[PDB]
Design a protein around this ligand. Structure first.
Ligand code: ZN
Ligand code: ZN
Ligand code: ZN
Ligand code: ZN
Lengths: 213, 6, 97, 91, 81, 571
């Protein structure tokens, strides 16, 4: 009942950030309540975990749950470099508590689809807080949720790490042929795995670049 | 001993 | 989409119209074959005249009863609908002889 | 633009032109000196032709249909005569 | 000119015939023991029957039976990755 | 003493020998006459003439009304499926074809189709052809959702309870959840219009679907929900189906007292109405033997499966999916019974049949192969250990290694990574890798099997204790870090005596592990003590192990239909 009241004034302009902070406030205070006046009883902690599962995994009548999309957006809304108001040291502390609200997600599979697609749009544009934060992000998910949960999500990272080497190998290739070959423009590439990246969609339309490329 | 139950 | 047929004497028009399509505009399609004025012709479902103002969906010719497999029927007049034919009956075989 | 169809009993089956492109035999009626175009279809009765042109509306609408196509009901009593038109019309 | 790239193997059937998993993903042998410490050498191999199989899967098949699982023809490798 | 043949039987053979001329007019015979004409065709071996008329729905409709001789129709139906012609597939397609033709017709003709659909769909569900029973039930469900009347939703709920039964046995668990949700639509609509539909059989089907997906917490929750709505006015087949699948949820919940009072009454109630040679009776024994398999009733667990298979074999012909599942349990029961002796002769043959029957009738990617190929791989593992020739060992272990991962992949696709069955295969692979000398891979598999199975089941479970024993048996021999196995073995005995007592089969390999662990470091003050423990182990279980089967153990039941239901519910 207190959890639903926390996620009641649903501010549409800041839905994901207010959602995780409200649950963190409820969880961060009641973890003290079970510990500062009560003993650390696993019966009471199990009730808190069971109750916070109910409020986070709330399905509207004849509607889907709002939990997986907001948690996917919350990670994107902070790992994006546009909000230059916090540092990576504050990111690690902030996102460590993001694991606690993540463990209450009933449908973690659909969160991965929402996160990977959101990461796909964010990562290929070259915009993010930092590359090691993305490495740390999938590192914490692979230990909190599961080994094969971030199977395609691990390959979301470690793709542009070898792209730089591949670009240098391409730069090595362009300077070692018998003749002189120039592309006429600064060419930068990064290759993606078909079975990992969600970039398939439906390419029903062909394309034919002119002679300039 | 023998194995897991099916 | 709504599919239906109209029979005056022996003709059959397999035309299509939207679920919200009215009655006045489909008479122009009928005019293209019979060469008859739209006000002179009148249509009759289940022994009942259809108004021009009401649509096809307001008289009962909805999608489920007007499927592209077995569409709803409606008469026409200016009823003299002729039955198609009598198919050769099949013995039940399972029935004792 | 409109293709007629007469039957054994004289029933008229005037329908849309492009609904009849499925069967090439109907296009043979339009082709030649036939080019509404008068057609004689005496050997095939009216009741079975009520399902022949009925299949045309089913055929054209479901061409590359995203949803799963429901089967076209063919009554067991009319199964024998309708299959005669299927081979004759190559439909 | 910045550009993305999406790569896939030359296989078309898009499925391994032994592990039954997606050919782009790891084989069942490498999807159980180590998905990060072994995935970098989970390659695939073609054959004279033009049937690209997971290298771990095809080797594990060749441990006992030296015939192609799809069609019963002697299995000879033709190209690797 | 040469009793003359009855004129009824004599006239049967008089028209069978003249079948071709009078083929048309036999269909005009009465149903009791008509069935005996067809049963004689099977007896004479004229399956082609027998199959020449069962392919028609109308002919098979009259034959299905011989309820007394249904046990002969099943044996003839399976004979046709081994004869060639797919009489199950054509009947389902023919019924589904004619079913859609009366959608716009009246409800008088329509109601006959559902009655035909339930007897035919129920028969194919009994015969095991779940892939063809589903197409029958989906057609009759469509009719019930065309005209809105109070009787139509009364049978639409009756389709979804049986639709959810033909999808539990066909391993279509993903579509099973949708049917239950679709069931609640008509079930709640009927409840609003002054008719509280009985949620007993419909809730009883989740006692197997969620049990199959190892949702033991959710299955036991639905075990209680299904058991509440039982009623003495329910059909006995419906009642016994609830008790069987409710008892299974209790066995995996590590509760033994309330499970046996449920399943023994299920055996008693099934034997009473149906008999000792009915398919529903044999379906109870497999669920009953599942209880005996987990309570260390190993001596009669093989016999009860052997009894269960013989019932199905006498009624379900040859290549039938129900015989394979009966073959499956007996193959595994002999695997654990012949563990010390090593006599896996009939164990592999039953396992080989289990592969043989399913591959002919089910697709290669069907999940029932994964369950079936797992046990055969376990047979191949212990066979290679017992064999003296090392060349034989290196081939058979790889063959078993082929089956586990092929089985594991099918489990992974349908159940997800975090499930008991996927972790169940991890435990098998760890033991397999011990025989495969891939000790480092064995360590990886065992920790996977113990960090996943324990994660959702809990710290105290039967299968978790065995998974510890697999890794405890590892550190004793290959890794040789006895300190790791000292804590692991101590967990194995700890959970063993909570429910199974000291005399448990897996604990023998656990007490011996402690002595083997202690023998390496020279400890002897516990070796002498634990040698006395084995002497206590060797006697105390064998003191109370004397030969006693289970068919006379249940005998007549003093407990009645209501005496079992309320006792389990209040406790
Ligand atoms: Zn593979
Ligand atoms: Zn691999
Ligand atoms: Zn091949
Ligand atoms: Zn035959």
């Amino acid at each position: 009942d207190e959890g639903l009241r926390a996620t009641s004034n649903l501010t549409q302009e800041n839905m994901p950030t207010l959602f995780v902070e409200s649950v963190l406030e409820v969880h961060g205070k009641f973890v003290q309540l079970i510990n500062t006046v009560l003993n650390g009883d696993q019966h009471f902690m199990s009730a808190l975990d069971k109750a916070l599962t109910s409020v986070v995994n709330y399905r509207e009548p004849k509607s889907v749950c709002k939990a997986p999309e907001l948690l996917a957006k919350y990670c994107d809304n902070l790992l994006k470099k546009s909000a230059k108001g916090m540092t990576e040291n504050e990111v690690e502390d902030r996102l460590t508590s993001f694991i606690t609200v993540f463990k209450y997600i009933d449908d973690k599979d659909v969160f991965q689809k929402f996160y990977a697609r959101m990461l796909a749009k964010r990562l290929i544009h070259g915009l993010s807080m930092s590359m090691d934060s993305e490495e740390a992000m999938i590192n914490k998910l692979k230990q909190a949720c599961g080994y094969e949960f971030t199977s395609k999500l691990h390959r979301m990272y470690t793709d542009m790490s070898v792209s730089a080497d591949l670009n240098n190998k391409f730069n090595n290739f362009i300077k070692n042929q018998d003749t002189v070959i120039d592309l006429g423009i600064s060419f930068q590439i990064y290759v993606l795995q078909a079975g990992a990246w969600p970039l398939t969609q439906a390419p029903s339309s062909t394309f034919a670049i002119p002679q300039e490329l | 001993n023998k194995g897991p139950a099916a | 989409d709504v599919f239906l047929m109209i029979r005056r004497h022996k003709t059959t028009i397999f035309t299509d119209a939207k679920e919200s399509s009215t009655v006045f505009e489909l008479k122009r399609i009928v005019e293209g074959i019979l060469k008859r004025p739209p006000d002179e012709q009148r249509l009759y479902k289940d022994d009942q005249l259809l108004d021009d103002g009401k649509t096809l969906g307001e008289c009962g010719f909805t999608s489920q009863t007007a499927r592209p497999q077995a569409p709803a029927t409606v008469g026409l007049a200016f009823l003299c609908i002729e039955p198609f034919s009598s198919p050769p009956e099949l013995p039940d075989v399972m029935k004792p002889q | 633009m409109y293709v007629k169809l007469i039957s054994s009993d004289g029933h008229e089956f005037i329908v849309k032109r492009e609904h009849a492109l499925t069967s090439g035999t109907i296009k043979a009626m339009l082709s030649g000196p036939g080019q509404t175009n008068e057609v004689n279809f005496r050997e095939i009765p009216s009741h079975v032709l009520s399902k022949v042109c009925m299949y045309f509306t089913y055929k054209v609408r479901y061409t590359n249909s995203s949803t799963e196509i429901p089967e076209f009901p063919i009554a067991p009593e009319i199964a024998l005569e309708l299959l005669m038109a299927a081979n004759f019309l190559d439909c | 000119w910045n550009a993305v790239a999406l790569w896939a193997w030359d296989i078309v059937v898009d499925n391994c015939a032994i592990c039954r998993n997606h050919i782009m993903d790891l084989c069942i042998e490498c999807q159980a023991n180590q998905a990060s410490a072994t995935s970098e050498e989970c390659t695939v191999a073609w054959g004279v029957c033009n049937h690209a199989f997971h290298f771990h899967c095809i080797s594990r098949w060749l441990k006992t039976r030296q015939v192609c699982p799809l069609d019963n023809r002697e299995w000879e490798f033709q190209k690797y990755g | 003493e040469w009793i003359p043949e009855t004129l009824y039987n004599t006239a049967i053979s008089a028209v069978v020998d003249n079948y071709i001329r009078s083929r048309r007019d036999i269909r005009s015979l009465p149903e009791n006459i008509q069935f005996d004409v067809y049963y004689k065709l099977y007896q004479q071996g004229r399956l082609c003439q027998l199959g020449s008329e069962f392919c028609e729905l109308e002919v098979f409709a009259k034959v299905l009304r011989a309820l007394d001789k249904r046990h002969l129709l099943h044996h003839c139906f399976q004979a046709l499926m081994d004869h060639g012609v797919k009489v199950a597939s054509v009947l389902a397609y023919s019924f589904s074809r004619r079913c859609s033709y009366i959608a716009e017709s009246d409800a008088a003709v329509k109601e006959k189709a559902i009655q035909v659909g339930f007897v035919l769909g129920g028969f194919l569900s009994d015969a095991g052809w779940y892939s063809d029973a589903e197409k029958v039930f989906l057609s009759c469900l469509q009719l019930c959702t065309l005209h809105d009347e109070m009787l139509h939703w009364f049978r639409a709920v009756e389709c979804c309870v049986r639709l959810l039964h033909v999808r539990n046995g066909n391993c279509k668990y993903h579509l099973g959840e949708e049917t239950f949700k679709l069931a609640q639509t008509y079930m709640d609509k009927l409840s609003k219009h002054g008719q509280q539909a009985n949620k007993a059989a419909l809730y009883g089907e989740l006692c197997a679907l969620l049990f199959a997906k190892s949702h033991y917490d959710e299955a036991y929750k639905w075990c209680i929900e299904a058991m509440k709505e039982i009623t003495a006015g329910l059909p006995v087949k419906v009642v016994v189906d609830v008790l069987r699948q409710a008892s299974k949820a209790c066995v995996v919940k590590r509760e033994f007292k309330k499970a046996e009072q449920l399943i023994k009454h299920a055996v008693y109630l099934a034997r009473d109405h149906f008999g000792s040679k009915h398919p529903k009776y044999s379906d109870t024994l497999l669920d009953y033997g599942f209880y005996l398999l987990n309570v260390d009733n190993i001596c009669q667990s093989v016999a009860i499966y052997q009894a269960a298979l013989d019932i199905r074999q006498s009624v379900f012909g040859g290549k039938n999916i129900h015989v394979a599942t009966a073959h499956e349990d007996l193959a595994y029961s002999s695997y654990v019974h012949q563990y010390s002796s090593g006599k896996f002769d009939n164990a592999l043959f039953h396992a080989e049949r289990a592969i043989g029957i399913i591959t002919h009738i089910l697709p290669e990617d069907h999940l029932l192969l994964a369950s079936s190929k797992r046990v055969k791989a376990l047979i191949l593992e212990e066979i290679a250990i017992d064999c003296h020739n090392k060349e034989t060992e290196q081939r058979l272990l790889q063959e078993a290694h082929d089956l586990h991962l092929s089985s594991l992949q099918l489990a992974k696709k349908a159940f997800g990574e975090f499930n008991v069955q996927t972790a169940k295969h991890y435990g098998n692979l760890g033991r397999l890798y011990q025989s495969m000398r891939k000790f480092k891979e064995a360590e990886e598999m065992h920790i996977k099997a113990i960090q996943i199975k324990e994660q959702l089941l809990g710290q105290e479970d039967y299968e978790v204790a065995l998974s510890v024993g697999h890794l405890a048996s590892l550190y004793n021999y290959d890794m040789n870090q006895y300190e790791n196995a000292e804590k692991l073995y101590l967990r194995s005995i700890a959970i063993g005596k909570k429910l199974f007592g000291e005399g448990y089969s897996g604990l023998e390999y656990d007490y011996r592990g402690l002595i083997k662990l202690y023998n390496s470091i020279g400890n002897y003050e516990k070796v002498f003590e634990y040698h006395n423990v084995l002497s206590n182990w060797n006697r105390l279980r064998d003191r109370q192990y004397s030969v006693t089967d289970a068919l006379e153990d249940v005998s007549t039941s003093p407990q009645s239909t209501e005496e079992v239901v309320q006792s389990f519910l209040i406790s």
